[PDB]
């Protein structure tokens, strides 16, 4: 399970850069006929704007879902850059052998040149429409033929495409300031990058959700993920002092002899490599990921208690978990400190607000230990915002290691005391146990400086702010794993390679970018759904997808409540500029798309008065209406939420004028005999019997010479009068000149996703490695 | 297991005739295969000769032409 998490993290590819090959379109021209007024038909035909892919459902709720789906299409298509030359094509009728942006645009231009029934002006316009360039600026202007909404979307994708000019300075500036300013690293590159180049910037916007505020199940997983990632980049302690010889110094100083190699209970039992490395890895990874770590030790082993002092000094106490260090401090006080002044053991209480070192700092009267314990109790992190990110920083006294001198002062004092209450052998054992640390003093100092340096160096490669909050699950830390580290160490510096840093930084960047981008997705759909009145829509599967695209969770064991709270927070986030503009371009044109689409209609008027039909021209005479004024209206989605067919039934039985509003199908009837027979009034009797309104299909009375009974109109002097008009708009007329636009773009750029691959990096020899204070680390011998 | 049966029937019937180009042959590609396995979790050794595990991940930067070699094998 553990290794899988890192497999998922390091397989987080960045957000795949988009580049479209064609243009987003909703509309297309289409030849229909034209019927001159009085109804009869021209020999000539005419182009009109119609919709590609009439797929609009019935009912208003389903239509608003459709426009949400359209928003989803446009977002999924929404690119990051584009080069128009790669999609451009020839124009087969251009004077200058020019080009145009899309194949369908070219098809239109090459189809209108061939028709008999096209003006000469458009043919001239086709001869004179061509591409143009200006190469000093690397800018191109291509023709295009585009519906205005299509032009709006495409023009937004042109003007708001996310790229940034790439140079050799920005490569450096992508690295943190500390690494550039750290003299232990040397950087260079073997390429100069032109101004023709480009690069995309990640979205490194900090946590909009505050998952460290009562999303503990997610924060536990996140913190665990970052911890285990940090374990894969903390260096292994490549070089050590020996184990057998060191243990022989322990067994020749302490006279537990012979063959205490095998007998293992006192001052020993976890001296090995395999814990020293664990502690070295764990401390740094925990402080970086901000993960609390619990302690599993034994009280018989007093060297563990002694090396816990060093631990509780160099590391803050608010970083651990409470009961463990309470036990450890209590133990230390009861058997190293208070017996060193003839004080009582202690009388500690389980649920006490203060830890033993606090309430012990004031009791005993010794300067050294008092100021040591003062430091310990008041040791804590320093919050500070640097490069935008919050950071938990060490004291700046731990870093330039002098805390260990206060520690040695205290321990030497305790050596100088007597233990009156206790025998000589016990004191002898303890005092030898702390002389064994005194003899390792300089190495401890060096270790402290080395941990601080590696910690800040790896802190540099972090993008998400690092909060100090306790967690559900912990990481075990045997105190023998400190004692090992404190006893197996010396004259062996380990500096993280620059490549590990770049790897870790790019991983965190990619996780953070994925996080923000998917947040923006979810926020976009939530805001859009809430502004389109979608009330039957359960906003869960979207959040399930959101958590699935973050490749660290287990959706099998996350509930609905966390999802809905996460949604409640996501409601309150501003939508990014791209998505917001595309949505406000859709709220102002969803109706204009919905006025089109000859498969549904926006209503039907029912006024029992023999009213006139309208002289349109793509049709002839029609029972169409385009204003919906006068008569009172009834919304059908209202009627289908709360079924109350009392009003409408009352209104139909009494032949009362009314309008019905909602996406309604329709069927064209080109029979004049269906006009005088009045079949469109025959459709509303099924609404009073079977109160459903779903199989409701009003009539459209399109009349023209293609109707087989039109001759009556041209023989009997009657304008078509009728009843029960339909509320519907007409298609728009295709103006070739006015539909033409010029699309601008950049000429021939190149997009580079990774940005540090051009950097080659090297380390100074780690013996001569230096900290903030311009003073060497790992120098005591 | 089944794969054991496959291996055994496929070696027993060829080891009755081939006795010079069988173990030398099939044991040779392995040297390339080791350069294809991503490390996820590691064991280390000190200069002082002690194991010490590492969660280090390492990819497998294998060139292209050794695959052609492997295919010939």
């Amino acid at each position: 399970p553990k290794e899988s998490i890192l497999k998922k993290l390091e397989d987080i590819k960045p957000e795949q850069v988009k580049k479209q090959t064609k243009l987003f379109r909703i509309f297309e021209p289409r030849q229909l006929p034209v019927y001159r007024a009085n109804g009869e038909k021209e020999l000539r035909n005419r182009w009109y704007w119609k919709l590609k892919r009439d797929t609009l459902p019935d009912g208003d709720y389903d239509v608003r879902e459709y426009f949400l789906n359209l928003y989803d299409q446009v977002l999924t298509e929404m690119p990051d850059y584009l080069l128009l030359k790669d999609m451009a094509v020839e124009n087969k009728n251009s004077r200058d052998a020019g080009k145009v942006v899309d194949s369908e645009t070219a098809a239109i231009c090459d189809a209108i040149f061939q028709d008999e029934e096209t003006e000469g002006v458009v043919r001239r316009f086709i001869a004179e429409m061509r591409q143009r360039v200006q190469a000093d600026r690397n800018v191109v202007n291509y023709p295009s033929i585009l519906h205005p909404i299509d032009h709006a979307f495409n023009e937004y994708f042109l003007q708001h495409q996310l790229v940034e000019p790439l140079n050799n300075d920005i490569i450096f500036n992508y690295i943190p300031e500390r690494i550039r300013n750290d003299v232990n690293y040397i950087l260079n590159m073997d390429r100069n990058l032109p101004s023709t180049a480009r690069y995309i910037r990640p979205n490194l916007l900090q946590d909009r959700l505050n998952l460290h505020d009562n999303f503990e199940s997610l924060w536990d997983t996140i913190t665990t993920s970052n911890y285990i990632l940090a374990r894969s980049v903390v260096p292994d302690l490549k070089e050590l002092v020996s184990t057998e010889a060191q243990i022989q110094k322990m067994s020749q100083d302490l006279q537990l002899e012979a063959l205490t190699i095998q007998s293992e209970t006192q001052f020993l039992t976890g001296i090995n490599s395999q814990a020293a490395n664990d502690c070295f890895k764990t401390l740094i990874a925990a402080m970086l990921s901000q993960r609390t770590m619990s302690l599993d030790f034994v009280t018989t082993n007093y060297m563990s208690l002694i090396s816990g002092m060093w631990l509780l000094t160099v590391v803050p106490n608010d970083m651990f978990i409470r009961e463990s260090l309470v036990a450890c401090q209590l133990a230390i006080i009861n058997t190293i400190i208070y017996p060193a002044f003839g004080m009582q053991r202690m009388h500690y209480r389980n649920g006490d607000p203060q830890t033993p070192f606090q309430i012990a700092e004031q009791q005993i009267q010794n300067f050294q230990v008092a100021n040591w314990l003062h430091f310990v109790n008041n040791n804590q992190f320093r919050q500070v915002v640097i490069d935008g990110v919050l950071n938990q920083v060490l004291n700046d006294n731990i870093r330039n290691g002098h805390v260990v001198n206060q520690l040695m002062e205290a321990l030497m004092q305790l050596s100088r005391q007597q233990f009156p209450t206790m025998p000589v052998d016990y004191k002898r054992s303890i005092q030898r146990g702390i002389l064994l640390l005194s003899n390792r003093l300089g190495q401890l100092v060096d270790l402290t400086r080395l941990l601080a340096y590696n910690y800040e160096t790896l802190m540099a490669c972090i993008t998400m702010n690092m909060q100090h909050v306790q967690t559900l699950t912990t990481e075990k830390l045997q105190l023998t794993s400190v004692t090992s580290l404190c006893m197996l160490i010396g004259n062996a510096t380990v500096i993280p390679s620059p490549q590990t840093l770049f790897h870790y930084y790019n991983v965190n960047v990619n996780f953070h970018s994925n996080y923000n981008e998917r947040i923006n997705d979810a926020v976009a759909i939530i805001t859009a759904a809430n502004r389109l009145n979608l009330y039957q829509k359960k906003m869960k599967s979207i959040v399930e997808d959101f958590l699935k695209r973050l490749q660290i969770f287990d959706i099998s064991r996350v509930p609905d409540d966390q999802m809905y709270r996460l949604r409640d927070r996501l409601r309150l986030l501003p939508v990014e500029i791209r998505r917001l503009d595309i949505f406000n371009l859709i709220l102002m044109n969803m109706e204009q798309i919905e006025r089109a689409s000859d498969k549904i209609a926006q209503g039907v008027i029912i006024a029992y008065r023999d009213m006139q039909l309208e002289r349109d021209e793509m049709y002839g005479y029609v029972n169409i209406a385009r204003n919906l004024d006068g008569f009172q209206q009834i919304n059908l989605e209202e009627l289908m939420r709360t079924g109350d067919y009392a009003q409408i039934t009352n209104m139909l039985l009494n032949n009362q004028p009314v309008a019905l509003v909602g996406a309604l199908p329709f069927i064209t009837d080109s029979s004049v005999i269906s006009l005088v027979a009045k079949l469109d009034a025959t459709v509303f009797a099924q609404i009073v019997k079977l109160r459903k309104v779903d199989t409701l299909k009003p009539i459209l009375y399109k009349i023209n010479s293609d109707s087989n009974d039109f001759y009556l109109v041209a023989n009997y002097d009657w304008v078509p009068t009728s009843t029960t008009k339909v509320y519907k708009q007409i298609p728009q007329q295709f103006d070739f000149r006015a539909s033409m636009h010029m699309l601008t773009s950049n000429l021939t750029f190149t997009v580079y996703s990774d940005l540090l691959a051009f950097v080659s990096a090297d380390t100074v020899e780690p013996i001569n490695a230096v900290a903030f204070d311009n003073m060497r680390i790992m120098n005591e011998l | 297991s089944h794969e054991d049966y496959l291996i055994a029937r496929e070696l027993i019937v060829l080891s009755y005739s081939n006795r010079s180009t069988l173990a030398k042959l099939v044991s040779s590609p392995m040297s390339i295969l080791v350069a294809l396995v991503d490390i996820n979790g590691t064991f280390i050794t000190n200069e002082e000769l002690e194991l010490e595990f590492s969660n280090k991940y390492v990819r497998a930067i294998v060139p292209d032409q050794t695959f052609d070699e492997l295919k010939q094998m």
Binding site: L193, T750, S753, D754 | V62, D64, K71
Partner: peptide, 28 residues
């Protein structure tokens, strides 16, 4: 056989792409 063999040769090219290589290759 050999159609599937050549496709096996091919799928070990597209896969396991290094990032520095594609950067220097776009430049080159």
């Amino acid at each position: 056989n050999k159609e599937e063999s050549k496709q096996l040769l091919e799928v070990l090219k597209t896969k396991e792409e290094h990032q520095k290589e594609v950067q220097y290759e776009i430049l080159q």
